[PDB]
Amino acid sequence: PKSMQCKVILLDGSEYTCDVEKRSRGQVLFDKVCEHLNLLEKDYFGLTYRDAENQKNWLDPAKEIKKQVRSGAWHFSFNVKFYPPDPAQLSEDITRYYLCLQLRDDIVSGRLPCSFVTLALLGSYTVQSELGDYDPDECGSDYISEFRFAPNHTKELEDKVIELHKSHRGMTPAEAEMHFLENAKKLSMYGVDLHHAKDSEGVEIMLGVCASGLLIYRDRLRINRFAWPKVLKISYKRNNFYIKIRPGEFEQFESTIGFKLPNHRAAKRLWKVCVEHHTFFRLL
Ligand SMILES: C[C@@H](NS(C)(=O)=O)c1ccccc1Cl
Numbered sequence: 001p002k003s004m005q006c007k008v009i010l011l012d013g014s015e016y017t018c019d020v021e022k023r024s025r026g027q028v029l030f031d032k033v034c035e036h037l038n039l040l041e042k043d044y045f046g047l048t049y050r051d052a053e054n055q056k057n058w059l060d061p062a063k064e065i066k067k068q069v070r071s072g073a074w075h076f077s078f079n080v081k082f083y084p085p086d087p088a089q090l091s092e093d094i095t096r097y098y099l100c101l102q103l104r105d106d107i108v109s110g111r112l113p114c115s116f117v118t119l120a121l122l123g124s125y126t127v128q129s130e131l132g133d134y135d136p137d138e139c140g141s142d143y144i145s146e147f148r149f150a151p152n153h154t155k156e157l158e159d160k161v162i163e164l165h166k167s168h169r170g171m172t173p174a175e176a177e178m179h180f181l182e183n184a185k186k187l188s189m190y191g192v193d194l195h196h197a198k199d200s201e202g203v204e205i206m207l208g209v210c211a212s213g214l215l216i217y218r219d220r221l222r223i224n225r226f227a228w229p230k231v232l233k234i235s236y237k238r239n240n241f242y243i244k245i246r247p248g249e250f251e252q253f254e255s256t257i258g259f260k261l262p263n264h265r266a267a268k269r270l271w272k273v274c275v276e277h278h279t280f281f282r283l284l
Pocket of ligand 1: 228232235274278279
């Protein structure tokens with residue numbers, strides 16, 4: 001039996017290596033990674049890989065790994081797939097911990113925009129969790145933390161993290177992690193997966209997929225939002241992604257909104273992430 005070596009970037013930035021039989025389905029690798037992480041609440045997570053145009057794809061746990069990575073290296077990342085709208089309801093602190101690690105990367109990367117004060121508050125909870133109670137000894141007036149807090153660091157931000165850290169004396173890691181989540185979960189881009197698209201008039205938009213529904217970011221003025229109840233059906237054809245919207249009571253006919261995606265693969269990827277999030281919505 002022939003086995004392929006897999007490399008998985010974990011959310012702490014470390015590498016996990018294991019072997020699976022070469023015809024293995026994604027679930028086999030995912031189960032190994034989750035066991036390594038002592039993770040039981042597995043349904044919120046997934047593995048991604050980078051394709052031959054270097055975009056993120058979810059590894060489908062039901063399909064052979066070889067038919068998804070195809071020509072590429074068996075290199076993957078471990079990621080949050082479904083962001084819980086209420087992290088306080090997860091059963092395990094270790095689940096909340098990995099969710100925090102993912103969000104820290106969402107913030108540093110700029111995928112999750114955050115005000116100065118929220119960047120500092122989130123950072124303050126990360127420090128409390130990681131180092132425990134504030135200590136002046138390892139924090140001079142010139143202190144800069146090893147922790148990455150934001151897409152752009154300033155001395156201002158470092159100082160505000162320290163000032164807020166001082167207020168958390170006696171907080172345990174699980175408590176600090178829960179506060180981090182209670183704040184992060186309220187950010188307007190929490191758990192929003194963004195896709196570049198053009199509207200039916202060829203105007204560049206962003207489509208966001210999340211637990212509550214679909215977002216169309218035409219720009220800062222006019223964000224259209226479709227709760228999952230409002231979406232009748234989704235479809236893709238060629239480079240096109242179409243959404244059917246229920247009529248208001250007594251209107252007779254649903255409306256169709258069409259979008260142009262970069263290519264066929266980008267359309268299919270959007271479709272699949274919408275289907276997966278809609279099932280998520282359905283079962284909450
Ligand atoms: C899961 C998906 N099915 S379908 C028939 O492909 O549109 C769906 C069905 C109703 C609303 C939204 C979505 Cl995403």
